[PDB]
Design a protein around this ligand. Structure first.
Ligand SMILES: [Mg+2]
Ligand SMILES: [Mg+2]
Ligand SMILES: [Mg+2]
Ligand SMILES: [Mg+2]
Ligand SMILES: [Mg+2]
Ligand SMILES: [Mg+2]
Ligand SMILES: [Mg+2]
Ligand SMILES: [Mg+2]
Length: 50
RNA sequence: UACCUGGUUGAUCCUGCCAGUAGCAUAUGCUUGUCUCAAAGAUUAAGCCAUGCAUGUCUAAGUACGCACGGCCGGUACAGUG
């Protein structure tokens, strides 16, 4: 299941401004950046060993 | 600038101090037109304090769902300033 689908959003409607919806930033979410950081942490050990 | 002078006697030569002389640093008195520097509640009380200020800090890079502002899609995690 996808977490990004099930985020609880907040409606936000002030007088004189268009209606809006806001959702929080998901924390502890596996993203390609996290995997790439782990990949480089692994890849530095190979350089040290060589 | 390696310097002296007056004072004890009726008069003289001495010892010997007092006073006289020139710097310096604290206060004080009188006086004071122009410019450059410049010390400044140490001395008696490390005695007592009204009031105000004198230590705070964010980058692309720890944590933003404060519309407090703000552009597009509009479930389509999180645009950006903060
Ligand atoms: Mg995280
Ligand atoms: Mg005489
Ligand atoms: Mg003298
Ligand atoms: Mg003039
Ligand atoms: Mg004092
Ligand atoms: Mg004192
Ligand atoms: Mg002082
Ligand atoms: Mg100070």
């Amino acid at each position: 299941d996808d977490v990004r689908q099930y985020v609880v959003r907040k409606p936000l409607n002030k007088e004189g401004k268009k209606p809006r919806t806001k959702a929080p930033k998901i924390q502890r979410l596996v993203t390609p950046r996290v995997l790439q950081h782990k990949r480089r942490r692994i890849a530095l050990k190979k350089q040290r060993t060589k």
